[PDB]
Amino acid sequence: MPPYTVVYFPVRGRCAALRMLLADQGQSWKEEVVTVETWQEGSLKASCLYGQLPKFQDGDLTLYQSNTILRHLGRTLGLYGKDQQEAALVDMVNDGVEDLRCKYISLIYTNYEAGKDDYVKALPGQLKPFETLLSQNQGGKTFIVGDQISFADYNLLDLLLIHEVLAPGCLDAFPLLSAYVGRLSARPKLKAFLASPEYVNLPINGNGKQ
């Protein structure tokens, strides 16, 4: 049985990136799916540290918080830069990704209808820093930080994939982000996972909006 377990609603959401990470790194794991019927029963929610999912298990280490899981796998799998300075740039990227994801989540779940036009308006100036970071790292030909992939790459990649669904062609303004998505998506294990039923047959969000 795998050392890892992902406990989550039947959605991509805040586990999509860590799932890509494990897949591309060839790690096995178990998915425990939580129905909203189980969730409304209240027992599992009451036992979650912050009342929420994802919950993640690595042996007897139980974690909550999606970016905590991301940094842990990045720590234990060597996806956290080459040295102490790169580690800090990796965080800086991932914190920006988290910032934009929180805006994305706020739109999807609380104001999709009245908010979508302004969000798509503001989107280029939100994506530009990631384009800027790429332009400053090997002219955007490798990864978001340094010369080896990090957990920020997978979280950023997810953030870029789901915005393409929300605002088709939003990467047309960003040649390096665009080639970045195509390049990372083509990694054999990752490509295989993204095409697979366990990824394709889950919706992005739990409320059916995208």
Ligand X SMILES: N[C@@H](CCC(=O)N[C@@H](CSCCS(=O)(=O)F)C(=O)NCC(=O)O)C(=O)O
Annotated binding site for glutathione: 8, 14, 39, 45, 52-53, 65-66
Partner from ligand X, a second copy, none contacting 14, C-beta within 5 to 8 A by type: ligand X
Q: Any contact of residue 36 with a second copy (CB under 8 A)?
A: no
Residues in 42-81 that interact with ligand X by CB under 6 A: 45, 51-54, 65-67
Q: Any contact of residue 122 with a second copy (CB under 8 A)?
A: no
Q: Any contact of residue 11 with ligand X (CB under 6 A)?
A: yes
Shortest Å, Cβ 14 to ligand X: 5
Task: Determine contact, residues 151/80, Cβ cutoff 8 Å.
Answer: yes
Partner from a second copy, ligand X, none contacting 63, C-beta within 5 to 8 A by type: a second copy
CA distances from 180 to 25, 74, 107 (A): 18, 20, 25
CA 51 – CA 53 distance, rounded (Å): 7
Task: Determine contact, residues 183/189, Cβ cutoff 8 Å.
Answer: no
Residue closer to a second copy by CB (options 11, 92) is 92
**Helix, strand or coil for residue 12?**
coil
Q: What is the DSSP letter of 139?
A: G
CA 162 – CA 165 distance, rounded (Å): 5
Residues in 88-117 that interact with ligand X by CB under 6 A: 95, 99, 105
Q: Any contact of residue 21 with a second copy (CB under 8 A)?
A: no
Detail the DSSP E strand segments found in the chain. Answer: 4-8, 29-33, 55-58, 61-64
User: How many residues at the interface with a second copy, by CB under 8 A?
Assistant: 27
Q: Mention every residue, 6+ apart, whose C-beta is less than 8 A from residue 68.
A: none
Phi and psi dihedrals of 101, rounded to 5? -55, -35
Q: Which residues bind ligand X (CB under 6 A)?
A: 11, 13-14, 45, 51-54, 65-67, 95, 99, 105, 205-206
Q: Which residues bind a second copy (CB under 8 A)?
A: 49-51, 61, 63-65, 67-68, 71-72, 75-76, 84-85, 87-88, 91-92, 95-96, 99, 102, 125, 129, 132-133
